[PDB]
Write a protein that binds this DNA or RNA. Structure first.
Lengths: 46, 114, 118, 54
RNA sequence: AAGUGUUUAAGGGCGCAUGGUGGAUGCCUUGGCACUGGGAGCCGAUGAAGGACGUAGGAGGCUGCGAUAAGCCUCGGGG
RNA sequence: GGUGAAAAGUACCCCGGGAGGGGAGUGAAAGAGUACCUGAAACCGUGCGCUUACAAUCCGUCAGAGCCCUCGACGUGUCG
RNA sequence: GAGUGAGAAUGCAGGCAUGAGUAGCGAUUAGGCAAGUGAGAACCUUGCCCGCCGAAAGACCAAGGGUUCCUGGGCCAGGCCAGUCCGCCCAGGGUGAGUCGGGACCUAAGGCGAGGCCGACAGGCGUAGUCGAUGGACAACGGGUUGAUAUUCCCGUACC
RNA sequence: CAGACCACGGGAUUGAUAGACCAGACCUGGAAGCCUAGUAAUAGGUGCAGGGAACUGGCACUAACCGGCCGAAAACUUAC
C-alpha cells in the first residue's frame, strides 16, 4: 500500500518552518506572533 | 404490613435491562431460593443482584431482627443509573457512541409467615 | 473414533488432533483433568482407544500410542500402570463429570477422570 | 436496510420481553451434612466434591 | 336430549401510586455587558510588551518573586 | 456554578473484596450525603385497577356493557 | 418597556429513546492441561506440552513519542469481554562518555546576510561574512555488573 | 441420519441411548519385531498381516443421576 499520512513529524523542520525565529524574521510573522500574544496564546509559535 | 428491609446497590456497572433479566427470575421468591437461582444463573448480572439481595437479608437479620428463613424477596427492581459516553471509531473515520450504563438495584425483603 | 460431526474442536483438524493428544497426555498424567465439556466428550473415546492400546501391551501398541502421545513418560505410565490397571475392565476407562461453567465465557465444563473403582 | 419508522412502545416491548433468562432447575444435594441446591446437571459433581458451593 | 355460560395473560395498552435517570424550572451568584465621572495617557538598550526555566519543607496548577527567587532593605499606616 | 447556617461531611455495627447500601448518629431538614438547592419533560422501571391472544386499529371521537370510591331515603345494595 | 409566547427552519445545545440486548468485538498462528494467586481467572504467574514467526513476528540504529523504563502498590475509568494483569492509575527510583552521536572542527544545497545595489513605502536581491549534514576530519576495545545505565559504571588492557 | 435455536428415541437403569470393549462387515493392502536373501537400494516368511470410522450384532465397563418443575369440574334451561 501507500499509507503515508500527511503529517510526518520532524522537530527540526517544525522549528525551521513555523519557529519563533522564522516568525520574527518577517513583519508578517511578527504580526502573527503579536496577534497570538494579544489573543493570549501560551504557544505563540512552534 | 410485613416487616421489611431495604438494600440498594447503586451505580452497579451493569445495564438496567441486564440486571432486570435476573431480577425477573428472583422476584417473588424466598431469599434462599432467590440466592440459589442467582448462584446458578449463568448471567453475570446475577452477582450484583445476589449481593444486594443478600445485603437486604442481612439488614433484615441484624438491623431489623427478622428471621432469615421467613424472608422473601418482596419488591426488587433495577432502575437505570448514570451512563458514561464513550467513542468507538468506525470505518471512514466516523465516531459512534458507546453507552457504559449503570443500574441501581433496589431490593426490599419482607418477613412473611409461610 | 467417530469423527467430529461439526466444526473441529481446536478451530481446525490439525489443532483438534494436537488438542486431543495434549488432553490425553494430561489425563494419563494427572488422572483427572478439568476442561470444557465438548473437549471431554471428544477426548473420552480418544483416551479410551489409547488405553486399549496400552492394555494390549506390546511393542506395536506402544508405537501406535507414541504416534499420538509423543510423551515418552506418559507412554510408559500408560503401558506400566494404566494397561495393567484396566486389564480386567472391558471398556469405559474414563468418566466425564459435568461441573460448573466458566465465569469468563460460560463455557460448559467437565472433569474427565480415569476410572479407579476396581 | 434501515428501520423506516420508530418502533412503537407496544411492539418494542412485546418483542423485548422475549429476551428473558430461564431459571435453572435446582435439586437438593447433601454435602458436608448441609442440604444445598445445585442443578441436577451438577448433582454428581457436587456429590463428588467437584462443585464449589462457597 | 341440544342450547346458554363467567373463568387464563406469554406479552401489550390505559390509568394511578412509587421510584430512577436527567438537569429544565424557580431563586441566586464568584462572572460578564453597556455606560458615567475622574486619573494616566505611553513602556523599552538603566533591556520593554510578553514569556521559558526556576523559586516554599513536601507533587502540580494559579499567584508572587528571580540563584537575594511566595522573597531582601528603608520609610510610613495597623495592631 | 448552587450540600448545609455551620462539615457539624455520617463515629460505631452489619451485608459486601470493593462499590453501594441497612441500622446508628449529625443536622430544622439527609424529601440536603462532597453523585449533594428546587428537581420539569423526554427516557427507564416496580406495584395496583380495568382491559386485551377470531383480530385489519391516523390509534381518536360519539354512544357504550362489564369491573372501585364520595351524601342519603331505606337498613342495608339500589337507586342519583 | 419588552431579549414577551415555537412544533417544525435536513434549526442549535444538553439529555434520552428506535434499530437492540441487535451488528461488531479488528486477520490470514492456537491453544491445552497441572499447580499458584486471588473475593473473583479462558485471559495474570509458574511448570510442562502444543502451535506460529524465524531476510522476522529475532536483535539493534535513526526519526518520532516522552517516562510509557524499573521497583512497590491499585483495579469503579481505559483494554472492544473479564482481569488479580497491563503501554492504564499512584508513589519512589532510574539515563554516568576525553574516545559512542552531535556542539566546541569543516563545509554542500539552501537560509540569513554588515555594508551595498535595486524598489514610492512595504520590501527584492546580494557581496564580505555567517550558519546550514544527509557528507569530510576526529582518540577504545573485550569482559563483568544493576531492578532499571553502560564502548559511559567497574575489571583488564588501549589510544588523543 | 432430528436439528440454526424445536420437537422425536433412551434413561431416573425394570437400560443397549451413546462411547468404550469384543466380534463381524467394510476400506486400505501385507504392520511392528524377528528371521532369511542380497557389499545395498530392497525383496521374501511370519501373515488375508497390521491399522481403522460412521454400519451390524453382542457387552452395563463409562454416562444416562438416590431430581426438580408443571399438571381436576362455577353451573343453568329445555323430552324421557
Amino acid at each position: 500500500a501507500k499509507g503515508k499520512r500527511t503529517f510526518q513529524p520532524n522537530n527540526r523542520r517544525r522549528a525551521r518552518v513555523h519557529g519563533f525565529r522564522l516568525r520574527m524574521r518577517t513583519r508578517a510573522g511578527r504580526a502573527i506572533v503579536a496577534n497570538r500574544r494579544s489573543k493570549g496564546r501560551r504557544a505563540l509559535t512552534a | 404490613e410485613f416487616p421489611s428491609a431495604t438494600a440498594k446497590a447503586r451505580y452497579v456497572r451493569v445495564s438496567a435491562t441486564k440486571a432486570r433479566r435476573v431480577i425477573d427470575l428472583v422476584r417473588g421468591k424466598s431469599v434462599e431460593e432467590a440466592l440459589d437461582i442467582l448462584r446458578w444463573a449463568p448471567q453475570a448480572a446475577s452477582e450484583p443482584v445476589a449481593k444486594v439481595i443478600a445485603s437486604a437479608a442481612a439488614n433484615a437479620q441484624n438491623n431489623e431482627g427478622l428471621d432469615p428463613s421467613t424472608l422473601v424477596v418482596a419488591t426488587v427492581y433495577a432502575d437505570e443509573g448514570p451512563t458514561a459516553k464513550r467513542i468507538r471509531p468506525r470505518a471512514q473515520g466516523r465516531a459512534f457512541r458507546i453507552r457504559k450504563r449503570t443500574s441501581h438495584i433496589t431490593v426490599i425483603v419482607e418477613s412473611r409467615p409461610p | 473414533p467417530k469423527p467430529t460431526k461439526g466444526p473441529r474442536l481446536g478451530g481446525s483438524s490439525s489443532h483438534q488432533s494436537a488438542l486431543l493428544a495434549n488432553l490425553a497426555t494430561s489425563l494419563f498424567e494427572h488422572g483427572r483433568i478439568k476442561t470444557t465439556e465438548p473437549k471431554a466428550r471428544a477426548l473420552r473415546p480418544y483416551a479410551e482407544k489409547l488405553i486399549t492400546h496400552a492394555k494390549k501391551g506390546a511393542l506395536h501398541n506402544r508405537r501406535e500410542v507414541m504416534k499420538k502421545i509423543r510423551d515418552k513418560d506418559v507412554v510408559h505410565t500408560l503401558f506400566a500402570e494404566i494397561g495393567p490397571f484396566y486389564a480386567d475392565r472391558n471398556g469405559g476407562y474414563t468418566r466425564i463429570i459435568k461441573v460448573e461453567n466458566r465465569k469468563g465465557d460460560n463455557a460448559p465444563m467437565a472433569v474427565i477422570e480415569l476410572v479407579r473403582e476396581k | 436496510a434501515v428501520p423506516k419508522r420508530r418502533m412503537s412502545r407496544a411492539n418494542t416491548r412485546s418483542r423485548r420481553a422475549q429476551w428473558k433468562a430461564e431459571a435453572p432447575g435446582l435439586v437438593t444435594v447433601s454435602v458436608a451434612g448441609q442440604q444445598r441446591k445445585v442443578p441436577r446437571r451438577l448433582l454428581k459433581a457436587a456429590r463428588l466434591g467437584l462443585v464449589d458451593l462457597d
